[PDB]
Every structure is written in C-alpha cells, then in structure tokens.
Symmetry: C2
Subunit: 288 residues, 2 copies
C-alpha cells in the first residue's frame, strides 16, 4: 500500500480570525489535542510511514510539534504526570514528518503539487488527508486501498448526504460496482441545487492519488489550481477513479461551529469532562 | 486611576497538553478570539494605556499577536471581509504592549515582580489580570478603582461561592464595610475544607496593587517561588489597606478544557453565526452517550 501521506495545511483558516493571525489552524485543540495530530494518527493507522505537511513559512511551528520535547518530557516524568507524558510522546513517535514550505496559499491543488519534490521512487500512490475533515472511526484510507488494489488508478471519498442537504458540496456523478460503498467516478458537480445533484455522494477530504495527479496538476489552467480539475483531466484521459462511501461519523473543523460540535462530542465521551459538561449543557441550552 | 495592566502568562497550561507544547495557552480561541485579547480588551475598557505581558522566551509569539498584519489586512479588505478586518485590527489598536521575560515559571508572585522593570514613575498602582479568569461583564477593575480611591492601598477580587463548593480556592478572612460588595481583607486561607472556610469569598484573578507590593515581594522568603499572598499578608501586617470587591456577575474558567469549552459554548450560543445550529445539535447530542 501507500507509505506517504500528504496533509495540505497552507490556508490561514479565515473563519477562526483573529486567532489564526498567530496560531496555525491545524494546531487548534479539539478538547486538548490538535487536528494535525488526529489526522497524523489516522494516516499512521492506515500504514503511512511518512507525513508531508504542506504549509506556509509562518506555520512552521507545526513542524516543531512533531519533534521530541526533552525538557518538558523530563519535567512531566519528575512530576509523575505519566498520562500527560504519554500524550506529548504520541505525535513525535507516529511517523517520519517532512514540511514542504509553500510561499503563498494558492489552494488545495497547488498545495498537493508542492508535495511532489518530497516523493520518491516507492511513492506510486499518495494519501491526502484534509485536516478540517475528521472521518470516524479510523480506516477510510484502508478501504480506499482495497479499491486501489482491485482497480488501480485513484480513489476518492464521499459522505452519503440527502440531495436537499448537499448543495454546499461537490457531488459525484457515478456508476455502480459490485460493492455498494464503491462507485466509479464519471465527474463532479460543484454545489448543485438538490434537483441537479447527480447523486447523494458528497466529496470528502480523503484521497489516494496515483502519481499521475502531478502531471495532471501541471496541465490544468489556473483560475488557483483546483484539484477537482486535475482529477477531471485524469478521468478524461482514461485514468480509473473510484470513490468509497464513508458510512460512519464525521466532523467538520472548517468553522468554529463545526469545531465546537467536534470538541463537545469528544469531551462528552471523556470521563475527565463528560458528566459535568453534560449537566452544564442541559441547563445552558434551556436559556438564551 | 491605573495606566499599566500586567498579564501573568508564564505557565505552560499543562492541562491543555499536548497542544500547549506548541501553542501558548493564552492564544487558544474562545470561539474565534484568544483569551489574551479578551483580557487586553477588559484592561483597556478599565482605562489601561499599557499592557505588560509576563511570559517565557518560548511564548514571545503572544507579543506578535499585538502587532499589525498589513498583508492580511489588505487581503481581507480586497475580499470585502470588513468584519474580519475589524476583528484583526482590534487587538493591535487596544493599547501599548510590552513583554517581560521570565526564563522560569516560578509562579504568580515571581511573574508580577518581573514586571517591575517595565513600570515608570507614574505607576503608583498596577492592575493584574489572570488570563484564565473571565469576569463578566467588563467592569470589575473600575469597581476596584473606586475602593482604591476611598481607602487607598490595594484591592483584590472575589467570587461569592457556597462553602460546600469553595475548597479549590483561596478564601478570604474579612470584615464588613458600608458596601455589601466590599470587604476589608484580614487574611486568606488556602483550600480550606467547607467547615474551616472563613467566608464565602473565593480569590478571583483580578488585582489593583499599590507599588508597595514590589518591596513586599523583595522582602518575603522564597520557596525561588514568590507567593503573592505572602507579599499581600506582609503588607496587611504592616498596615497597608487591602480590600476585596465581590463580583456579582458571571465568570468563566479557562484553566482546563472543561471550563474552556463551557466558555466557548456560552459565547457561541449568543452568536447568530453559530448559536441556533449549535443549540439544535446540542439538544440531540446530550440525549445520547
Ligand atoms: K496525544
Ligand atoms: K468536504
């Protein structure tokens, strides 16, 4: 399977201004843990050995997150904070992390293209994880790998969303396969009204891209490089593209509202917070 | 009244690990805005002209937050994001900001004492705001300034907490004044059990300290930790007036992820961009594990 996962992390996160003026969006805590760690863990569990984070020069603190912190570790160990200590050791031990620095945030297609110098002869396919999407539980990339193994080519991800709730998404035009959760991708429609939606399958931020994507990204017309256009070009030129339908849960960290739903969902499942938080929420929602 | 506010911000925020390995606790967003902004804004609205942030070398980034971002401002203006532009211009425009470097987090008293080099002749009194306490609405420091005007000396802040729920706090030993929300401070008891708590007045993280505190912090015995309560006790013993104002409004505690989330939810429910959707989601969510 794939060994390299790419995380595009170039965008400011304008919905979290003013905080994202100074703090990388991908380091914001979900309860106590940054999304960059959550997606790094997902990638590792799907068998990534390497993570290529694409970011801006201002967001290099992301890199330092994945390096050991000797003094802090020694301090926690001396206080007997074994739980906090394990929690800080987790991210640095997940995988080999590299940062591809992109001077200007010019969109997702450009961010993926800037990862190409970090790839090697073994990278026939790369995983891509968008860090604003949490796809739960872990394992969507493993299902996508099964599809790559059977059909070759590239693999996308979809959420199954009713046509009347889908108009914020890219929506796949598809044909059936022998697996109910796997479709062949014919195209994508951006933000269709319900009556024009070609399917209930909404583009989700997980990919297994064949190396052919980099050539496709070089040959698309800018106007910012759209990854969808590069995928559309591959489909034109006969490259197989399938999509796996995620059936489980998801969170959207793209704006504070979605971010808070994720943090609350996770905090309610944690005994350090859950019971007291549940009691507080019960009363709080009964008043303005 | 006071012109300099001091914000102690030297501690890691060990309860927010692993995030605070890389992100200063005081930059974490409440919905979209960091605590450091919320306390700078409070301080400005109480008439501060200057902010002295006490932090470690590794957390100097807090300072950059208070510098303009011309390129970002331009890009927001060109997209017609006038709301977002206003939101990023706010913190740099609030007041003059300085940082005092405290290589080691030796505590609150140490932090306050490391701010003294940033004071000038006109700083007879300083405000101190702990960024983990949000005291709502704005205005507690103005109430404390009234007390300083009447009695001189130094002024603390308390929440009114039942004795069955107060044992996590420092608790004041007090006497009455002619104002029901103003007490004379005799002393403080650290984390009393309910039956030993001398009052229901729990120490909150707002202060108006007379300059005398620095000398007191120089004369008290170190742990090299410098306990601020020991410096205030020394002043009390030496006849320096110390009163406390009882906050009657709301509060949030950003000291741990649980109280942080309560703050963020409380604020998001009042924000039309998020409130209605969030409230409907919460309604369903709390009805299941
Ligand atoms: K962790
Ligand atoms: K999406």
């Amino acid at each position: 399977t794939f060994t390299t996962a790419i995380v595009p992390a170039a965008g400011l996160g304008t919905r979290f201004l003013p905080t994202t003026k100074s703090v990388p969006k991908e380091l914001l805590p979900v309860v106590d843990t940054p999304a960059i760690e959550l997606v790094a863990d997902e990638a590792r569990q799907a068998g990534a050995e390497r993570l290529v984070i694409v970011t801006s020069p201002a967001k290099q603190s992301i890199a330092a997150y994945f390096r050991p912190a000797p003094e802090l570790e020694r301090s926690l160990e001396e206080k007997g904070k074994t739980g906090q200590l394990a929690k800080i050791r987790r991210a640095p031990e997940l995988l080999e992390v590299e940062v591809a620095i992109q001077e200007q945030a010019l969109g997702l297609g450009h961010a993926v293209a800037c990862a190409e110098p970090n790839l090697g002869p073994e990278d026939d396919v790369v995983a891509v994880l968008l860090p604003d999407d949490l796809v739960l539980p872990h394992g969507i990339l493993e299902r996508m790998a099964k599809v790559r193994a059977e059909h070759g080519g590239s693999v996308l991800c979809a959420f199954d969303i009713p046509k009347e709730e889908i108009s914020a998404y890219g929506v796949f035009d598809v044909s059936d396969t022998d697996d109910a959760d796997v479709k062949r991708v014919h195209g994508m429609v951006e933000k269709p009204p319900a009556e024009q939606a070609p399917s209930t399958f909404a583009a989700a931020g997980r990919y297994l891209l064949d190396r052919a994507i980099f050539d496709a990204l070089r040959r698309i017309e800018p106007g910012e490089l759209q990854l969808t256009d590069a995928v559309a070009l591959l489909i034109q030129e006969g490259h197989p593209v399938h999509v796996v339908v995620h059936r489980g849960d998801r969170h959207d960290l793209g704006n504070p509202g979605g971010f808070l739903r994720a943090a609350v969902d996770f905090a309610l499942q944690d005994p350090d917070y859950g019971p007291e938080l549940r009691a507080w929420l019960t009363d709080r929602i009964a008043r303005p």
